């Protein structure tokens, strides 16, 4: 579990962002997820953005990285059903011509960088 003198070890926080993709007149959302076909209940893993079509709205934003961490889809708790379910969500989303993807990222915290070459004050 822990690798090294444990104790006073604070961690960073994580936020969530809503991705608004407009089902293009050709490449609706053009989003791909990674999982499986068969399972027991869930997918034994979160649905990560397998691939993102080009010239698509999912890419246009560029906020959707390959292998993202979708915590939900339009509120849907990505933690059950079959890979198809999630896949269906998108398709359906096409109806309203808008799909919501709950992503999760890290946020910079109060901490000084390392003295070297790269990051410059601004």
mmCIF file with all atom_site columns, C-alpha atoms in Angstrom:
data_model
loop_
_atom_site.group_PDB
_atom_site.id
_atom_site.type_symbol
_atom_site.label_atom_id
_atom_site.label_alt_id
_atom_site.label_comp_id
_atom_site.label_asym_id
_atom_site.label_entity_id
_atom_site.label_seq_id
_atom_site.pdbx_PDB_ins_code
_atom_site.Cartn_x
_atom_site.Cartn_y
_atom_site.Cartn_z
_atom_site.occupancy
_atom_site.B_iso_or_equiv
_atom_site.pdbx_formal_charge
_atom_site.auth_seq_id
_atom_site.auth_comp_id
_atom_site.auth_asym_id
_atom_site.auth_atom_id
_atom_site.pdbx_PDB_model_num
ATOM 1   C CA . UNK A 1 1   ? 0.000   0.000  0.000   1.00 0.00 ? 1   UNK A CA 1
ATOM 2   C CA . UNK A 1 2   ? 2.279   2.724  1.310   1.00 0.00 ? 2   UNK A CA 1
ATOM 3   C CA . UNK A 1 3   ? 5.825   2.961  0.009   1.00 0.00 ? 3   UNK A CA 1
ATOM 4   C CA . UNK A 1 4   ? 7.868   5.135  2.339   1.00 0.00 ? 4   UNK A CA 1
ATOM 5   C CA . UNK A 1 5   ? 7.627   6.805  5.727   1.00 0.00 ? 5   UNK A CA 1
ATOM 6   C CA . UNK A 1 6   ? 3.902   7.455  5.889   1.00 0.00 ? 6   UNK A CA 1
ATOM 7   C CA . UNK A 1 7   ? 2.222   10.137 7.965   1.00 0.00 ? 7   UNK A CA 1
ATOM 8   C CA . UNK A 1 8   ? 1.965   13.804 7.063   1.00 0.00 ? 8   UNK A CA 1
ATOM 9   C CA . UNK A 1 9   ? 1.215   13.294 3.388   1.00 0.00 ? 9   UNK A CA 1
ATOM 10  C CA . UNK A 1 10  ? -1.438  15.597 1.978   1.00 0.00 ? 10  UNK A CA 1
ATOM 11  C CA . UNK A 1 11  ? -2.896  15.032 -1.469  1.00 0.00 ? 11  UNK A CA 1
ATOM 12  C CA . UNK A 1 12  ? -4.228  17.370 -4.130  1.00 0.00 ? 12  UNK A CA 1
ATOM 13  C CA . UNK A 1 13  ? -7.915  17.841 -4.841  1.00 0.00 ? 13  UNK A CA 1
ATOM 14  C CA . UNK A 1 14  ? -9.816  16.977 -7.999  1.00 0.00 ? 14  UNK A CA 1
ATOM 15  C CA . UNK A 1 15  ? -12.483 18.877 -9.897  1.00 0.00 ? 15  UNK A CA 1
ATOM 16  C CA . UNK A 1 16  ? -15.067 18.040 -12.533 1.00 0.00 ? 16  UNK A CA 1
ATOM 17  C CA . UNK A 1 17  ? -15.740 19.600 -15.915 1.00 0.00 ? 17  UNK A CA 1
ATOM 18  C CA . UNK A 1 18  ? -18.784 19.320 -18.146 1.00 0.00 ? 18  UNK A CA 1
ATOM 19  C CA . UNK A 1 19  ? -18.093 18.642 -21.805 1.00 0.00 ? 19  UNK A CA 1
ATOM 20  C CA . UNK A 1 20  ? -20.714 20.045 -24.147 1.00 0.00 ? 20  UNK A CA 1
ATOM 21  C CA . UNK A 1 21  ? -20.491 18.437 -27.566 1.00 0.00 ? 21  UNK A CA 1
ATOM 22  C CA . UNK A 1 22  ? -22.884 19.369 -30.348 1.00 0.00 ? 22  UNK A CA 1
ATOM 23  C CA . UNK A 1 23  ? -23.787 16.391 -32.501 1.00 0.00 ? 23  UNK A CA 1
ATOM 24  C CA . UNK A 1 24  ? -22.234 17.617 -35.728 1.00 0.00 ? 24  UNK A CA 1
ATOM 25  C CA . UNK A 1 25  ? -24.149 17.198 -38.996 1.00 0.00 ? 25  UNK A CA 1
ATOM 26  C CA . UNK A 1 26  ? -21.639 14.482 -39.802 1.00 0.00 ? 26  UNK A CA 1
ATOM 27  C CA . UNK A 1 27  ? -19.454 13.626 -36.832 1.00 0.00 ? 27  UNK A CA 1
ATOM 28  C CA . UNK A 1 28  ? -21.997 13.924 -34.044 1.00 0.00 ? 28  UNK A CA 1
ATOM 29  C CA . UNK A 1 29  ? -19.688 13.390 -31.093 1.00 0.00 ? 29  UNK A CA 1
ATOM 30  C CA . UNK A 1 30  ? -17.255 10.893 -32.567 1.00 0.00 ? 30  UNK A CA 1
ATOM 31  C CA . UNK A 1 31  ? -16.189 9.507  -29.209 1.00 0.00 ? 31  UNK A CA 1
ATOM 32  C CA . UNK A 1 32  ? -14.839 6.075  -28.358 1.00 0.00 ? 32  UNK A CA 1
ATOM 33  C CA . UNK A 1 33  ? -14.782 4.317  -25.006 1.00 0.00 ? 33  UNK A CA 1
ATOM 34  C CA . UNK A 1 34  ? -12.746 1.393  -23.729 1.00 0.00 ? 34  UNK A CA 1
ATOM 35  C CA . UNK A 1 35  ? -14.215 -1.610 -21.956 1.00 0.00 ? 35  UNK A CA 1
ATOM 36  C CA . UNK A 1 36  ? -15.632 -4.990 -22.904 1.00 0.00 ? 36  UNK A CA 1
ATOM 37  C CA . UNK A 1 37  ? -18.739 -6.780 -24.115 1.00 0.00 ? 37  UNK A CA 1
ATOM 38  C CA . UNK A 1 38  ? -19.233 -9.276 -21.313 1.00 0.00 ? 38  UNK A CA 1
ATOM 39  C CA . UNK A 1 39  ? -19.088 -8.641 -17.585 1.00 0.00 ? 39  UNK A CA 1
ATOM 40  C CA . UNK A 1 40  ? -20.704 -9.444 -14.257 1.00 0.00 ? 40  UNK A CA 1
ATOM 41  C CA . UNK A 1 41  ? -22.304 -6.134 -13.355 1.00 0.00 ? 41  UNK A CA 1
ATOM 42  C CA . UNK A 1 42  ? -20.086 -3.225 -14.328 1.00 0.00 ? 42  UNK A CA 1
ATOM 43  C CA . UNK A 1 43  ? -16.962 -3.041 -16.459 1.00 0.00 ? 43  UNK A CA 1
ATOM 44  C CA . UNK A 1 44  ? -14.424 -3.665 -13.721 1.00 0.00 ? 44  UNK A CA 1
ATOM 45  C CA . UNK A 1 45  ? -13.036 -0.337 -14.870 1.00 0.00 ? 45  UNK A CA 1
ATOM 46  C CA . UNK A 1 46  ? -14.031 3.242  -15.715 1.00 0.00 ? 46  UNK A CA 1
ATOM 47  C CA . UNK A 1 47  ? -14.971 4.150  -19.294 1.00 0.00 ? 47  UNK A CA 1
ATOM 48  C CA . UNK A 1 48  ? -11.958 5.962  -20.694 1.00 0.00 ? 48  UNK A CA 1
ATOM 49  C CA . UNK A 1 49  ? -11.972 7.818  -23.993 1.00 0.00 ? 49  UNK A CA 1
ATOM 50  C CA . UNK A 1 50  ? -10.563 5.137  -26.264 1.00 0.00 ? 50  UNK A CA 1
ATOM 51  C CA . UNK A 1 51  ? -10.401 7.390  -29.301 1.00 0.00 ? 51  UNK A CA 1
ATOM 52  C CA . UNK A 1 52  ? -11.599 10.810 -30.393 1.00 0.00 ? 52  UNK A CA 1
ATOM 53  C CA . UNK A 1 53  ? -12.621 11.293 -34.005 1.00 0.00 ? 53  UNK A CA 1
ATOM 54  C CA . UNK A 1 54  ? -10.942 14.131 -35.862 1.00 0.00 ? 54  UNK A CA 1
ATOM 55  C CA . UNK A 1 55  ? -12.700 17.207 -37.193 1.00 0.00 ? 55  UNK A CA 1
ATOM 56  C CA . UNK A 1 56  ? -15.282 16.308 -34.576 1.00 0.00 ? 56  UNK A CA 1
ATOM 57  C CA . UNK A 1 57  ? -16.762 18.367 -31.732 1.00 0.00 ? 57  UNK A CA 1
ATOM 58  C CA . UNK A 1 58  ? -15.235 16.023 -29.182 1.00 0.00 ? 58  UNK A CA 1
ATOM 59  C CA . UNK A 1 59  ? -11.854 16.968 -30.598 1.00 0.00 ? 59  UNK A CA 1
ATOM 60  C CA . UNK A 1 60  ? -12.602 20.544 -31.588 1.00 0.00 ? 60  UNK A CA 1
ATOM 61  C CA . UNK A 1 61  ? -12.782 21.370 -27.898 1.00 0.00 ? 61  UNK A CA 1
ATOM 62  C CA . UNK A 1 62  ? -9.547  19.464 -27.415 1.00 0.00 ? 62  UNK A CA 1
ATOM 63  C CA . UNK A 1 63  ? -10.553 19.245 -23.773 1.00 0.00 ? 63  UNK A CA 1
ATOM 64  C CA . UNK A 1 64  ? -11.202 15.548 -24.263 1.00 0.00 ? 64  UNK A CA 1
ATOM 65  C CA . UNK A 1 65  ? -7.922  13.682 -23.986 1.00 0.00 ? 65  UNK A CA 1
ATOM 66  C CA . UNK A 1 66  ? -7.369  10.102 -25.084 1.00 0.00 ? 66  UNK A CA 1
ATOM 67  C CA . UNK A 1 67  ? -8.042  7.902  -22.077 1.00 0.00 ? 67  UNK A CA 1
ATOM 68  C CA . UNK A 1 68  ? -9.888  10.479 -20.009 1.00 0.00 ? 68  UNK A CA 1
ATOM 69  C CA . UNK A 1 69  ? -11.669 9.633  -16.779 1.00 0.00 ? 69  UNK A CA 1
ATOM 70  C CA . UNK A 1 70  ? -15.405 10.009 -17.253 1.00 0.00 ? 70  UNK A CA 1
ATOM 71  C CA . UNK A 1 71  ? -17.034 9.941  -13.837 1.00 0.00 ? 71  UNK A CA 1
ATOM 72  C CA . UNK A 1 72  ? -20.486 10.128 -15.379 1.00 0.00 ? 72  UNK A CA 1
ATOM 73  C CA . UNK A 1 73  ? -22.335 10.702 -18.630 1.00 0.00 ? 73  UNK A CA 1
ATOM 74  C CA . UNK A 1 74  ? -25.062 13.324 -18.475 1.00 0.00 ? 74  UNK A CA 1
ATOM 75  C CA . UNK A 1 75  ? -25.340 12.545 -14.782 1.00 0.00 ? 75  UNK A CA 1
ATOM 76  C CA . UNK A 1 76  ? -25.308 8.807  -15.378 1.00 0.00 ? 76  UNK A CA 1
ATOM 77  C CA . UNK A 1 77  ? -23.057 7.159  -12.784 1.00 0.00 ? 77  UNK A CA 1
ATOM 78  C CA . UNK A 1 78  ? -20.515 5.392  -14.962 1.00 0.00 ? 78  UNK A CA 1
ATOM 79  C CA . UNK A 1 79  ? -20.245 2.316  -12.773 1.00 0.00 ? 79  UNK A CA 1
ATOM 80  C CA . UNK A 1 80  ? -22.671 -0.311 -14.015 1.00 0.00 ? 80  UNK A CA 1
ATOM 81  C CA . UNK A 1 81  ? -24.450 -1.703 -17.051 1.00 0.00 ? 81  UNK A CA 1
ATOM 82  C CA . UNK A 1 82  ? -22.591 -2.705 -20.191 1.00 0.00 ? 82  UNK A CA 1
ATOM 83  C CA . UNK A 1 83  ? -20.138 -0.751 -22.310 1.00 0.00 ? 83  UNK A CA 1
ATOM 84  C CA . UNK A 1 84  ? -23.047 -0.473 -24.715 1.00 0.00 ? 84  UNK A CA 1
ATOM 85  C CA . UNK A 1 85  ? -25.093 1.462  -22.186 1.00 0.00 ? 85  UNK A CA 1
ATOM 86  C CA . UNK A 1 86  ? -22.589 4.298  -22.084 1.00 0.00 ? 86  UNK A CA 1
ATOM 87  C CA . UNK A 1 87  ? -22.186 4.026  -25.837 1.00 0.00 ? 87  UNK A CA 1
ATOM 88  C CA . UNK A 1 88  ? -25.949 4.311  -26.116 1.00 0.00 ? 88  UNK A CA 1
ATOM 89  C CA . UNK A 1 89  ? -25.944 7.412  -23.947 1.00 0.00 ? 89  UNK A CA 1
ATOM 90  C CA . UNK A 1 90  ? -23.922 9.248  -26.568 1.00 0.00 ? 90  UNK A CA 1
ATOM 91  C CA . UNK A 1 91  ? -26.070 8.136  -29.480 1.00 0.00 ? 91  UNK A CA 1
ATOM 92  C CA . UNK A 1 92  ? -29.191 9.125  -27.581 1.00 0.00 ? 92  UNK A CA 1
ATOM 93  C CA . UNK A 1 93  ? -27.540 12.404 -26.660 1.00 0.00 ? 93  UNK A CA 1
ATOM 94  C CA . UNK A 1 94  ? -27.606 12.999 -30.397 1.00 0.00 ? 94  UNK A CA 1
ATOM 95  C CA . UNK A 1 95  ? -31.313 13.595 -29.925 1.00 0.00 ? 95  UNK A CA 1
ATOM 96  C CA . UNK A 1 96  ? -30.862 16.769 -27.913 1.00 0.00 ? 96  UNK A CA 1
ATOM 97  C CA . UNK A 1 97  ? -27.780 17.294 -30.047 1.00 0.00 ? 97  UNK A CA 1
ATOM 98  C CA . UNK A 1 98  ? -25.871 17.732 -26.809 1.00 0.00 ? 98  UNK A CA 1
ATOM 99  C CA . UNK A 1 99  ? -23.991 15.283 -24.619 1.00 0.00 ? 99  UNK A CA 1
ATOM 100 C CA . UNK A 1 100 ? -22.614 15.833 -21.137 1.00 0.00 ? 100 UNK A CA 1
ATOM 101 C CA . UNK A 1 101 ? -19.449 14.065 -20.051 1.00 0.00 ? 101 UNK A CA 1
ATOM 102 C CA . UNK A 1 102 ? -18.338 14.283 -16.439 1.00 0.00 ? 102 UNK A CA 1
ATOM 103 C CA . UNK A 1 103 ? -14.555 14.406 -16.426 1.00 0.00 ? 103 UNK A CA 1
ATOM 104 C CA . UNK A 1 104 ? -12.213 14.523 -13.455 1.00 0.00 ? 104 UNK A CA 1
ATOM 105 C CA . UNK A 1 105 ? -8.880  16.311 -13.308 1.00 0.00 ? 105 UNK A CA 1
ATOM 106 C CA . UNK A 1 106 ? -6.374  17.555 -10.758 1.00 0.00 ? 106 UNK A CA 1
ATOM 107 C CA . UNK A 1 107 ? -5.981  21.118 -9.543  1.00 0.00 ? 107 UNK A CA 1
ATOM 108 C CA . UNK A 1 108 ? -2.723  22.886 -8.775  1.00 0.00 ? 108 UNK A CA 1
ATOM 109 C CA . UNK A 1 109 ? -2.170  23.523 -5.085  1.00 0.00 ? 109 UNK A CA 1
ATOM 110 C CA . UNK A 1 110 ? 0.001   25.866 -3.054  1.00 0.00 ? 110 UNK A CA 1
ATOM 111 C CA . UNK A 1 111 ? 3.451   24.488 -3.776  1.00 0.00 ? 111 UNK A CA 1
ATOM 112 C CA . UNK A 1 112 ? 6.730   25.780 -5.154  1.00 0.00 ? 112 UNK A CA 1
ATOM 113 C CA . UNK A 1 113 ? 8.262   24.155 -8.242  1.00 0.00 ? 113 UNK A CA 1
ATOM 114 C CA . UNK A 1 114 ? 11.792  22.837 -8.597  1.00 0.00 ? 114 UNK A CA 1
ATOM 115 C CA . UNK A 1 115 ? 14.666  25.161 -9.413  1.00 0.00 ? 115 UNK A CA 1
ATOM 116 C CA . UNK A 1 116 ? 15.693  24.283 -12.949 1.00 0.00 ? 116 UNK A CA 1
ATOM 117 C CA . UNK A 1 117 ? 14.870  25.114 -16.549 1.00 0.00 ? 117 UNK A CA 1
ATOM 118 C CA . UNK A 1 118 ? 11.376  25.072 -18.003 1.00 0.00 ? 118 UNK A CA 1
ATOM 119 C CA . UNK A 1 119 ? 8.696   26.899 -16.003 1.00 0.00 ? 119 UNK A CA 1
ATOM 120 C CA . UNK A 1 120 ? 9.093   30.663 -15.957 1.00 0.00 ? 120 UNK A CA 1
ATOM 121 C CA . UNK A 1 121 ? 7.301   33.111 -13.695 1.00 0.00 ? 121 UNK A CA 1
ATOM 122 C CA . UNK A 1 122 ? 4.475   35.013 -15.344 1.00 0.00 ? 122 UNK A CA 1
#
